[PDB]
């Protein structure tokens, strides 16, 4: 047996259906052993090191690379030095849009201010009772969930003036 194009679209739509629980998270506020060259990630990891906070995912949607003229006059995304066009869940299969686009923005000091070197997109996150706000710190979280796609970086720095926009595209 083999995996079909429509099976990948079905997996993309499954990720769409799970989009409500998705949360952006960052961590690793301390230095690496090699700041000028961060280390490779470990796939077996269960949670980011030195978690700073969690933020709800602003946007999860299916996309595809754009092509003229049928995408010229429509909403568009730039990512990976390539143009992308949004496609709805109920039109993905006919468009063959088996790409998924993820985004979330950490605006200002809505989470604790400091350096950070790790980024990841968890799902199935649950906060404590009565914590309805999107932005969360690790003490307020009830269920951290799964450590879906994450990556390391060189250290950044943040302030009330700064917004950190983090996003991904994934082939599923």
């Amino acid at each position: 047996a083999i995996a079909t194009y429509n099976s990948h679209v079905e997996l993309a739509k499954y990720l769409v259906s799970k989009a409500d629980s998705v949360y952006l998270t960052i961590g690793k506020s301390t230095p690496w052993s090699n700041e000028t060259n961060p280390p490779q990630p470990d796939e077996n990891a269960t949670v980011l090191q030195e978690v700073i906070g969690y933020k709800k995912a602003t946007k999860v949607t299916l996309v595809r690379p754009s092509k003229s003229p049928e995408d010229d006059n429509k909403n568009l995304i730039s990512y990976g030095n390539k143009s992308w066009v949004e496609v709805t869940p109920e039109n993905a299969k006919a468009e063959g849009a088996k790409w998924v686009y993820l985004e979330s923005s950490i605006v200002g000091d809505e989470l604790p201010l400091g350096t950070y070197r790790q980024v990841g997109f968890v799902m199935d996150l649950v906060a404590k009772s009565g914590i309805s706000k999107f932005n969360l710190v690790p003490s307020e979280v009830e269920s951290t969930g799964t450590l879906l796609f994450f990556d390391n970086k060189q250290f950044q720095n943040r302030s009330e003036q700064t917004t950190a926009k983090e996003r991904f595209i994934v082939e599923v």
């Binding site: 990512y79 990976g80 060189q154 950044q156 003036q161 700064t162 917004t163 983090e166 994934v170 082939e171």
Partner: protein, 88 residues
């Protein structure tokens, strides 16, 4: 571009007052938003496609015109090592 190292980085300035919701022209469920504090004239949001010191904001303070509020956005995508698309 002259405080960071090079020219090939993506840098643009966003002007949110262009997306003020006007009664007629603006589409109802379009990209425009209702006028308020952020969607306001004398406001700008600068997107920068690379790592930067916080002191770069002070550099913009040296350059921007007086009376304009400044915001900076850090686009993590542009910094990603190699191709940023992840595979399963």
């Amino acid at each position: 571009k002259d405080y960071l190292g090079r020219d090939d980085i993506d840098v643009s300035v966003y002007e949110p007052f262009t997306n003020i919701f006007y009664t007629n022209k603006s589409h109802l469920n379009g990209e425009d938003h209702l006028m308020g504090y952020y969607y306001r004239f004398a406001v700008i949001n600068v997107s920068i496609g690379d790592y930067f010191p916080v002191e770069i904001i002070d550099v913009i303070n040296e350059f921007k015109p007086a009376g304009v509020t400044l915001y900076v956005t850090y686009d993590g995508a542009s910094t990603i090592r190699g191709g940023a698309i992840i595979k399963w």
